[PDB]
């Protein structure tokens, strides 16, 4: 059912409203996703000036429905089965020895485009830390997103660790706690334990004058 909205290239739209340690900001993004390949290409722009935090801290926040689930795992794809009505995605993202983000998002189709609309609140960030200190390198590592079914909420939970490369050669962990809930009341797939294996490359648009990020990502379900 929901899965058939993803047999081809789908336009994507991202919108975020944020507040980190009281600094407010906005971001708009556009691109396309092709779940056949688990492939995503997105470009984001800070519509409110300079970004208060490093672009990479926001990658996970800015569409797991574009994950490639292999044939033998199609029945474990909660993300697509909740479409077109979509889901709510909430996270606590805790940065080791520093602040946290709490985020809330709706992911759903609006006409022929997949839209991800987010609210983010950050607190307790050290003014001289890796985040507000802008000490993260402009790149992104490759991770496993571990998914589990949450029958009580008719959805799923995920847990994972993002490794942010720090300019001084160290690594800043960001622990991700995640909950997804369908928006429609119809049937959804509740999957067995599995994970998503992700790889992301960050780059810049040479002709872009605004503060921005270009993201290329590949996501593939595995573990069954």
């Amino acid at each position, epitope marked *: 059912k929901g899965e058939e909205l993803f047999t081809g290239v789908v336009p994507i739209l991202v919108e975020l409203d944020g507040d980190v340690n009281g600094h407010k900001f906005s971001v708009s993004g556009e691109g396309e996703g092709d779940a056949t390949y688990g492939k995503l290409t997105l470009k984001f722009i800070c519509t409110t000036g300079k970004l208060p935090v490093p672009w990479p801290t926001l990658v996970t926040t800015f569409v797991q429905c574009f994950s490639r689930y292999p044939d033998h795992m199609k029945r474990h794809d909660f993300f697509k089965s909740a479409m077109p009505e979509g889901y709510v995605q909430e996270r606590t993202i805790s940065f080791k020895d520093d602040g946290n983000y709490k985020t809330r998002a709706e992911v759903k189709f609006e006409g022929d485009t997949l839209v991800n609309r987010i609210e983010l609140k950050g607190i307790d960030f050290k003014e001289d830390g890796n985040i507000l200190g802008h000490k993260l390198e402009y790149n*992104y590592n490759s991770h496993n997103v571990y998914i589990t079914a949450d029958k009580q909420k008719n959805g799923i939970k995920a847990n994972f660790k993002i*490794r942010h490369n720090i300019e001084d*050669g160290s*690594v800043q962990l960001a622990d991700h706690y995640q909950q997804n809930t369908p928006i429609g009341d119809g049937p959804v797939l509740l999957p067995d334990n599995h994970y998503l294996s992700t790889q992301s*490359a960050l780059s810049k648009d040479p002709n872009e004058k605004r503060d921005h990020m270009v993201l290329l990502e590949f996501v593939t379900a595995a573990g069954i």
Partner: nanobody, 114 residues
Framework: QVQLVESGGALVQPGGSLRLSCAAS????????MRWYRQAPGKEREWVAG????????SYEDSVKGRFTISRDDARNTVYLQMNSLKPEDTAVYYC????????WGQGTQVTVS
């Protein structure tokens, strides 16, 4: 064409010293930060050490501070991990790491401290 290859792993007695090498191909070691991780069986793969791209800063995880030194020879495009005061707790497969568009790992080298 980006490749990393670790070497140097071996059996070593506690207290001993050992040096690991990470040979890099496909990119210049002096244009990218590089890192060592390790993974003991059972446990998760933890970050061990790193050096900035410019070379001006090095960092370590608390449990190896003052015992390990990371360095690099730019000309040989190689990164090293000098280990001293080896503890049996240091037993693990060691990996080096770089991000060049995407993240790359070497295949790892086994260090056994017994």
């Amino acid at each position: 064409q980006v490749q990393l290859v670790e070497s140097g792993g071996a059996l070593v007695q506690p207290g001993g010293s050992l040096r690991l090498s990470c040979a890099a191909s496909g990119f210049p070691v002096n244009r990218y930060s590089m890192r060592w991780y390790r993974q003991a069986p059972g446990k998760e793969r933890e970050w061990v050490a790193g050096m900035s791209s410019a070379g001006d800063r090095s960092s370590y995880e608390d449990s190896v501070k003052g015992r390990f030194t990371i360095s690099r020879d730019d000309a040989r495009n190689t990164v090293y991990l000098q280990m001293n005061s080896l503890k049996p707790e240091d037993t693990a497969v060691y990996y080096c790491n770089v991000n060049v568009g995407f993240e790359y790992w070497g295949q790892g080298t086994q260090v056994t401290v017994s």
